[PDB]
Amino acid sequence: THSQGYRCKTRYCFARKFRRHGMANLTTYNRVYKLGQYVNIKVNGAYHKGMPHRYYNGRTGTIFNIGPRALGVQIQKRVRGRIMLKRINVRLEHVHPSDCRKNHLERVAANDAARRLAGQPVPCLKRQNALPRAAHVVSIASAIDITPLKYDG
Amino acid sequence: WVKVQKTRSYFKRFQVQFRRRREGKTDYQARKALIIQDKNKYATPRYRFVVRRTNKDIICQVTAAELTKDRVVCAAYSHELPRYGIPVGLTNYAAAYATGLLCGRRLLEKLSVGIKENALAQLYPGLDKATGEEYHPDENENEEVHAFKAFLDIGLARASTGARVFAAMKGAVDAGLNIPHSMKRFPGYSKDGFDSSALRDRIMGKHVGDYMAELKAEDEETYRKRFSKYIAAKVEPLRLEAMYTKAHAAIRANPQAVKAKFEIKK
Amino acid sequence: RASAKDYVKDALRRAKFKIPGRQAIVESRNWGFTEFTKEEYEDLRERGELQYDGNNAHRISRKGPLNL
Amino acid sequence: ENPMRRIRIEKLVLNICIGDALTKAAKVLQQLTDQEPTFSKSRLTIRGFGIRRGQKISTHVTVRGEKAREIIERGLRVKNFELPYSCFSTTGNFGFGITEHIDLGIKYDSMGIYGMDFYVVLSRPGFRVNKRRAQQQHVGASHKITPDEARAWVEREFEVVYTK
RNA sequence: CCGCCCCCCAAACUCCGAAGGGCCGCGCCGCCCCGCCCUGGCCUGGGCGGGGCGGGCGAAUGCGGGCGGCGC
RNA sequence: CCUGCUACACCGGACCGCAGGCGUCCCACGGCGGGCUCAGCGAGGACCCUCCCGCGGAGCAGAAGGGCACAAGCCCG
RNA sequence: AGUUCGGCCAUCCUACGGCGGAAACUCCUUAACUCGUUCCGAAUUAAGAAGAGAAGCGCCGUCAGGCCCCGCCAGUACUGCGAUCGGAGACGUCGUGGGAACACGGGGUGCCGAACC
Ligand SMILES: [K+]
Ligand SMILES: [K+]
Ligand SMILES: [K+]
Ligand SMILES: [Mg+2]
Secondary structure (H helix, E strand, C coil), X not given: CCCCCCCCCCCCCCCCCCXXXXXXXXXXXXXXXXXXXXXXXXXXXXXXXXXXXXHHCCCEEEEEEECCCEEXXXXXXXXCCEEEEEEEEEEHHHEEECCCCHHHHHHHHHHHHHHHHCCCCCCCCXXXXXCCCCCCCCCCCCCCCCCCCCCCC | CCCCCCCHHHHHHCCCCCHHHHCCCCCHHHHHHHHCCCCXXXXXXXXXXXXXXXXXXXXXXXXXXXXXXXXXEEEEEHHHHHHHCCCCCCCCHHHXXXXXXXXXXXXXXXXXXXXXXXXXCCCCCCCCCCCCCCCCHHHCCCCCCCCCECEEECCCCCCCCCCHHHHHHHHHHCCCCECCCCCCCCCCECCCCECCHHHHHHHCCHHHHHHHHHHHHHCHHHHHHHCHHHHXXXXXXXXXXXXXXXXXXXXXXCCCCCCCCCCCCC | CHHHCCCHHHHHHHHHCCCCCCCCCCCCXXXXXXXXXXXXXXXXXXXXXXXXXXXXXXXXXXXXXXXX | CCCCCCCEEEEEEEEEECCCHHHHHHHHHHHHHCCCCEEEECCCCECCCCECCCCEEEEEEEECXXXXXXXXXXXXXHCCCCCCXXXXXXXXCEEEECCCHHXXXXXXXXXXXXXXXXXXXXXXXXXHHHCCCCCCCCCCCCCCCCHHHHHHHXXXXXXCCCCC
């Protein structure tokens, strides 16, 4: 290393994606954020104010503060045998709403929906890790006959 | 012989601009500073006063930006002004003032339909008998029901002293809308006092009537060429202030919009 | 060409003793320094569909502006 | 045949490139157009050419109107209504230049003699679409002026004969 | 000078891009009401609480867990 | 103290490892608003001027990497 | 079908040929006043209605360049875990998991939302 400034080792991660330079689209400022929400951190390399350190690129956290211009996010960070809860202040161009609990809200809505419908017996609503296949018949009227081939060189 | 600038490598790396930037219809630097709002104001609507001019017409609109579009809450087009008694001269300084007055009155009457106590058209009824003086509806400062607040979005037009964009804003203020502004860029201001009589002259179309008066004096052959539509509605250049004053009163009374049912063709 | 076909493997043998390690001498099915086999190249020339550069041979265009 | 297709004279630029001769030169353009002319500064330094950098080198003025057309029938009358066939650019413009400036008119040479470029631009009605601030687009390819279209127009309006 | 082919290359070249890693989530939800106070044109929001209701334990495998003091 | 690489796609990772930089410079070379578009090729014009196309091939104090076009570059208040 | 304001930012771009216009948008006409051009009403600001589908714009076309999807390339390149497998080594092999890219051939060539005629 021998040199460890704030933006060291950032040649590729802070660069823009191919044919995606210039100003951010205006959805970056029309989204509504709320206390307790989950967010992803992704650094946009063209916006230099409130730009988080490279350690936080690609982490997921929770909103603790809603300020006039920036958001406050809590990140769990491992330090040498313990986890630390870190708090940072980041401007809007580097935050996106996160879908880490999207799958869980769809299931909770679907179980209460399928309960309301009762199909008179209640269906099994636990997730199932893929089971071994059941017994079945398959036709061998038309079967292909293959074999190893000879070396060609 | 000569190197070719548009190779297939030039095209592969080319990034297109936003569709409405390629068409030269939107500046996104100014659009970002209009719709921005503090994040502890989570989903409160924010409004813009949009004034656009074309050849043959002047448009005003009140608008709120949403995620995937923006809603027009109200709009007034100056081609409606023929019904209130203004037959010719649309897109001049007076016609821009009247159209902003139409849009402002129409919006406040739309938000006060049914409300009995302290409705937005009784509270802040605007102004009467245009003077061309400074006025600010948010000075009244009712404690419990504030004035409607909007911002002037002028787009690609130049913000010169005496542009028609600012006249249309002025008629919106005189109908009761809180639009923040200063008197600079109006006719009759000298950095040491703003004199309102000079501003009432453009408002009442006085510069138009003096041009016809002199133009008829020397070159009456051009007077037919220059103002043919004025002379076919038989409005003579001495009754404009007569004609504009009646028009404003007929606007405040019935701001409501009557929809022209229409038939198209491909 | 055919008048040299006998003596090329003798000259490749000479070069092999100047190079470290184990080397293999082989004869290819291609036509010269081109990319088609002799039989493939022969037929393509037989019907017309094969382009010619200077010392290299390509295929019919079949793409882009028709003529002009 | 079509109106909105007719060619007209867009503008005429008089350029004088050369201590106080530029002051004398500006008055000459001043008393030939009734316009304050401008002054250009030097991009580089060429001790071979004798100009430092950031310094008053040339002068020029743009003329737009029926005035432009009159000054461009006295400039040709000097050249005897004669123009090179190859003096017409790939984009519909042609130029020329005189050596003594009193060949448009006799003036007491006080202010000394000078020599100018006459560079003429033509256009059709519609070229505004590429200059206006809002909704700016390139003119269509057919609507532009080919050099063959430019020759047929000036010889009809003027009487130039194209020594080849 | 220009256009098409073509042999061969890069730790400080990359339009493409793995295996492999990393961070987060996997039970309490709905629906109507009522109270308190910076934010909005407003009869707007947002936060913290109260009630009345319907519900309800929603991947596998293993297993009890957390905090401090003094010191080598 | 700082950039790129060594470093094996989270973070971290050694050498008297590789190629280099810093102890300064600027009341404007700073803040804000408005306007404008650069490098250049091609084609023209008396012994700098004009048009056209122009994804930045320019510029942004000084290393290296990244960033930026009705601008973060240039000119004016 | 059209105009103003937008979302996503090329299936929407670039080049060259076409075809259209009742309305709409545009081009267009003018220098009294307003304000403006390192010079210039070119731009821009003001004031207008004689003329237009020549442009821009909408549409159609092209063994068009680009862009986008699919198949092939290929269980190949490379790689996690395990081996008292082979080889002087450099390197390769087998068991058990994951799995590209270039090239190549066919298809395609903006849609969604508020207000007004
Ligand atoms: K650390
Ligand atoms: K050997
Ligand atoms: K057209
Ligand atoms: Mg602005």
